[PDB]
Every structure is written in structure tokens, then in C-alpha cells.
Design an enzyme around this catalytic site. Structure first.
Site, mmCIF file in Angstrom:
data_model
loop_
_atom_site.group_PDB
_atom_site.id
_atom_site.type_symbol
_atom_site.label_atom_id
_atom_site.label_comp_id
_atom_site.label_asym_id
_atom_site.label_seq_id
_atom_site.Cartn_x
_atom_site.Cartn_y
_atom_site.Cartn_z
ATOM 1 C CB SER B 149 -9.218 -4.294 -5.008
ATOM 2 O OG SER B 149 -8.452 -3.109 -5.133
ATOM 3 C CG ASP B 313 -14.342 2.063 -3.334
ATOM 4 O OD1 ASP B 313 -14.278 0.910 -3.817
ATOM 5 O OD2 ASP B 313 -13.389 2.864 -3.393
ATOM 6 C CG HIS B 346 -10.910 -0.059 -2.475
ATOM 7 N ND1 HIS B 346 -11.691 -0.300 -3.585
ATOM 8 C CD2 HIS B 346 -9.764 -0.755 -2.662
ATOM 9 C CE1 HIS B 346 -11.043 -1.104 -4.410
ATOM 10 N NE2 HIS B 346 -9.872 -1.395 -3.873
#
Lengths: 369, 368
Positions: B149, B313, B346
Site C-alpha cells: 500500500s 482494488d 486493497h
């Protein structure tokens, strides 16, 4: 104002007491509406349009109010919903703030705005008020009832509660009930408003009110109305061209704030709460004693034909919900055309991608004509 | 408490005058970190882990702190990142509030928290601080640098500014820069915090502060960290089980429950700084800026890399991980790009270890 009424609005008074689904009744209430196109001799070319949560009844321009309508490209002479053929009737949803009685309207019992004393609002109430309006206009059977977004729910409620009132139905990005994601989104939007100290428990009145909370509610809405990929494609990492701490720096931010202002300046906070809440509470198949849930309710509807469309990128009312409506109506004998639209505009597609949503609507109505 | 520091945290002090990318410097600052697994005599089995925006350095449980770590299933004996093979070093990002110097930390010049006086934070600063930390620990070259991330951005910045420091790289749901949708979301998250009357321009006192805004920021985050469709199938229209316009659906009670847990252990100002840094980072600006982001990636010196992303995502879309893989590959790195078919979006690298674990274990098995 808290109430923003189009200059050429017309009204139908809801006679005496108008009973609300979850309790209480409205007195001295009315529904704001506008029509487009000529109603024929048989009065059999009327088309009712039930709107999403935020628009007014000015769906299209007219010589008496040339300002473009919220559905300018869809409704008009020679357009998908051809006013040369149909008498389009658009109503401001009960509970709104664009002319129809809502929280910002005056309560005859007090001489003050209803505010939170307004009876809890249900999609069924919006449907019933629209049904009364059409009948008050001397129309006993609509050629078609069109519903988009929240209006898709309102239209289904109308079809279930007033089966003899519409011959056909066009459902655009609708659903029989809200799914978790959209409930979560609307929950945050309502939060943005209730968290604003300016809300004053709904008594902001003429004051500034929870304007900041409203801008935010609108921003969150806009961000979920169109595909993430489309946003990245329309703005990229472009910085604001206009050139103090933690302020906006990207064009996408500037864009959102800009359109958010237009909403915050033209909508009543309490009205938003009531309408938003109604959307979460609606559930087509939950009552009546018929059985089969939503699919059962759809099968019992009496429409002859229906056009059901949805956007492949819609994350609020996913495509599967539109398919469910199509399947249920067909299961009940209706001749249904279902069409998934390959558009990046998501839930806003029926509003901003009429280039794709328009032709199928015209095709269907050509058959209804 | 202002900062939420794990009990077994270790610290590396940053040099006085540590330069921040956008101006200013840090004095008496430090980076909090934790290690898992032993470093071999040759010191060639070290693995650095740069985290997302919210976690602390406690990636896994240990004897001196058995509390489960944020990546418990990924790091440990016999796990994807096998501590029996690697000396895993996880660092709390500069600007955070879990031990490393940030807005909630005490400014030695005043004896009071930095608050908004902390220098504007950049992803490059996080990378530089991490690089110093690794070197301070006597490690000249990492066997691998793992970035997930926000950490994906941090890792790339580190590879670009300190190319001699890492042999391989594992990039999980990262990007060379943020796309419009993610920027808008974080902008709204920061707005929820700044719109809260308890913020006081960053001068909130102990106790609550802009708590409501922090809750909303986290809820919006959770809503975008996972598939909208996954949400619908997870809660349905079930109402809240426990007896105006308040919450009524379970999805709402779920969001509030986890949002509060977050709000109780994160400093609002620190959140603002980290969030802003994510929007400002652009790998293409470094190295003379030649060839933009793709050029920067090709100039990196990693020998091998594993790049993974989730198909669902919406914050760091798969195309962004494809971009990273291609850039590194075009530069000569032996890259393995693996799109993961998961609904966890995500959050996949955190909650779907069944799909993320095997590939990581295989890649590191080769690096070993």
C-alpha cells in the site's frame, strides 16, 4: 429558502389528510409537477417520470421556462422520450424541497416549517402522491411510468400499489431494495450533515445551516456515482489550474467542491435526511400477504411491457439489481427488454450518458406508441 | 496518550538536521522498529518491511510482546516471510504516531507536541529515514525490501534514492503515484477530520478531540478498501442486533465498531500528514525526471521482484501494479507479476493471505 421551486411549477393539492405509511398524515400538502408535450384526446399518451433523490420536476426546457431541465437530452421534441408523441408528467417527490411538501414546507398547524416534525417518509408515500397527481390530471391509465435511481423504487411501489395505472414501465438503474454498500454510503452522507454543528438538530432554518456537511454529502455521492477508473481518466493527477493548510491541490478536488456548492445551495438538509432514509427502508416484497418476496411482488405487477436498463459500472445499484427487476417482471408475464449499458459513468449514466441510454429508450417507446 | 508505541519497540535516532524534502529538518527525531527472526553472521538475510498508512511496527507476535501483529499470518516461523530464514525489520513510517517521530511527538525545541508545526511530510522522507535505520543496524544490503500500500510508494522511493541497499523487492498493491479516485477519497477523509469542531486547527488536547471525524475518515477508508460487491454479500440488509436518523443496519454497526478501534489508537494530525504525503508522491520526479515514472523504475538496481495486486482494488488499481512490474522489468529486473483474483480489494494483502501467502513464500524461497 430551503425550498427551491421552478418558476413554471404547477401543483396538485393532496386533498384533506394524506396518510403516511409509517404513521401520521399530511394536511394542506401538495405535489409540484410539470408537463411536457401535448396530452391527446384519449388521454392515453401520458408518461410519468419519477426522479432520483435530488432533482426538481423541471425535467426539460419549455417556452415558459427555457432553462434546461435535469433530463434535457432525454425528454423533448424528437428526443428519446419524444414530447411530440408523449405527454410527459414529472413530479417533485413528496418529501423533497422543490415544490412538493417536505420538511422545509410550512405546517398549517404551526405556521412554521415542519423540520423534524415531518412524518417519517416512505417510498410508498412518494408513489401514492404521484398516483393521486396523475389521476387529478384526469388520467386513468399511463402509457408508461419511468423511474430512475430512487425513482426506480418509487415506480415499483406505484406498480405494486396502483396496478391499473400504468400500461408499461421503464426502469433505469433501479432496485427492489438497497444493498449494504449504498446503505453505508448514504449513512455517511447523512452523517456529514448531522455532524455539522450548523444542523442544530434540524432547526437551522434561515441560518447558514450545515452547509459544509451538505457539500461533503454531495462529494461522497458524486464519488460513488461514477466509476473510479472514469475519474482517473477525466482528471488524472492534474493540479488545479487556478494555482491555507491542507487545502485542495488537485483538479479532481476543485471539480468536486464546485459541483458540491451547487447542491448545498439548492437543497434542504432535513429533506435530504428524510429522502435518504426512505431509500434505505424500502423493500418491495416485504409485505401485503402475497409471498415470494420481491420476485413475487414483481411477478404480480400488471404491466404489459417493460424496458429495464442499468450501467455495468454502477456500484450503488449494481447491474444485478436491475436484472432482478427484469426477471421478476418477466416471470409475471410482462414482455421485458433488459439492457446492460457498457458505460464508465456508473449510477450517473442515465443522466450523463444519454448517448448510450437514449436510443434503447426511444426503441422501446416506439413499440409502445 | 498522544503516541501509541508497542512495548517492545526499538529505536534508531535520525541525525540532527535530517532534511525533509519540502523544507525544514528534524532534530532529536527517531524511527521505531521491530525485528523478527535472526540475522545471519554474514548479515545477508535481512528483509525490510515498509507499511501502509495505519499500522505500527509490530508486524508479528514475539516473546517480549505476544500481542498479535498486523501481519501475523504473513510473518513468522514457517510462514510466507519465514523468520527461520530472514531477519525481518519492520519500521514505523516517519510522520506516524506509533513510535517514529511525527506530529504527536515532542518537539525538543519546545518541549511540546509538534502538532501542525511538524515539517510537511513526503514519501521520500519515509524512505530516507528507513534507509538510515537499516544502515544504522549495520546492514549494507537487504536481501529484500517489502512494500505494501503506502509502503509500496515508500519502497519505490527507497529503491530510487538508495539503489545499493536492496537486492530484491516485493511490491504489494503499490503505485508510482496516486490516481484521482484515491486522492478524492483521502481528501474527504482529511475533510471529515478538519470539519470536526474538536480539531482546533490541530491543537486538540488529550481525550477525544476530533473523534467523530476520525471515525468517519476510517469508515470511508474501510468502505473503499474492499469490494462494494463484497460488502453487499457480507451483511445484506440485516438490522443491528442490539436493541433521529441514527444507525439501523448491521453494516453500519460493523463500520462504527472498527472505526472506533482505529480512532482510539491514531493521532489525527499524524493521519493528515501521512494522507497528504500519499497524494503528493510521484516517483517520476526523481532522478532528473528522465522518462517519468517508467524511467525511474528502469533505473532501479533490484535483481528480482514480485509484484502483486488485487483485481478489485479501487484505490491502487491493478493497472498501477502492472506499471510497476513493467518498469522494473524494462530495467532488467527478473519480475513476477501476479494479479490476485480476490474480492478483498486493497485489504487483500492483509486479509487474504491464502492467495497472497503462497506466491510470497515461493519468491523468497528462490531469493534464499
Amino acid at each position: 429558502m430551503r425550498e427551491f421551486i421552478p418558476p413554471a411549477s404547477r401543483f396538485i393539492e393532496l386533498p384533506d389528510g394524506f396518510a403516511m405509511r409509517r404513521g401520521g398524515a399530511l394536511y394542506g400538502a401538495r405535489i409540484a409537477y410539470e408537463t411536457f408535450g401535448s396530452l391527446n384526446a384519449a388521454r392515453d399518451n401520458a408518461v410519468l417520470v419519477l426522479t432520483g433523490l435530488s432533482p426538481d420536476a423541471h425535467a426539460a426546457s419549455r417556452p415558459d421556462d427555457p432553462t434546461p431541465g435535469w433530463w434535457e437530452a432525454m425528454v423533448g421534441p424528437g428526443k428519446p422520450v419524444d414530447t411530440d408523441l408523449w405527454h410527459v408528467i414529472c413530479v417533485n417527490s413528496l418529501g423533497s424541497c422543490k415544490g412538493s411538501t417536505g420538511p422545509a414546507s410550512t405546517d398549517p398547524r404551526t405556521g412554521e416549517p415542519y423540520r423534524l416534525s415531518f412524518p417519517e417518509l416512505s417510498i410508498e408515500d412518494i408513489a401514492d402522491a404521484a398516483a393521486h397527481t396523475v389521476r387529478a390530471l384526469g388520467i386513468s391509465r399511463l402509457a408508461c411510468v419511468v423511474g430512475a435511481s430512487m425513482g426506480g423504487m418509487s415506480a415499483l411501489a406505484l406498480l405494486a400499489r396502483h396496478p391499473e395505472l400504468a400500461r408499461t414501465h421503464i426502469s433505469l438503474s433501479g432496485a427492489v431494495h438497497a444493498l449494504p454498500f449504498s446503505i453505508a454510503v448514504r449513512s455517511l452522507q447523512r452523517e456529514a450533515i448531522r455532524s455539522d454543528p450548523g444542523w442544530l438538530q434540524g432547526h437551522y432554518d434561515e441560518g447558514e445551516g450545515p452547509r459544509r456537511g451538505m457539500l461533503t454529502a454531495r462529494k461522497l455521492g458524486m464519488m460513488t456515482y461514477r466509476s473510479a477508473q472514469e475519474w482517473d481518466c477525466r482528471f488524472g493527477r492534474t493540479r488545479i489550474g487556478e494555482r491555507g493548510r491542507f487545502g485542495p491541490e488537485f483538479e479532481v478536488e476543485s471539480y468536486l467542491d464546485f459541483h458540491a456548492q451547487r447542491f448545498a445551495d439548492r437543497f434542504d438538509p432535513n429533506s435530504y435526511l428524510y429522502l435518504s432514509h426512505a431509500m434505505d427502508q424500502f423493500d418491495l416484497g416485504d409485505g401485503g400477504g402475497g409471498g415470494g418476496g420481491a420476485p413475487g411482488a414483481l411477478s404480480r405487477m400488471r404491466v404489459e411491457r417493460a424496458l429495464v436498463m442499468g450501467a455495468r459500472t454502477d456500484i450503488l445499484f449494481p447491474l444485478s439489481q436491475q436484472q432482478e427487476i427484469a426477471d421478476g417482471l418477466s416471470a409475471g408475464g410482462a414482455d421485458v427488454s433488459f439492457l446492460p449499458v457498457d458505460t464508465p459513468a456508473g449510477h450517473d449514466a442515465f443522466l450523463v450518458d444519454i448517448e448510450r441510454f437514449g436510443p434503447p429508450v426511444a426503441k422501446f417507446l416506439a413499440i409502445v406508441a
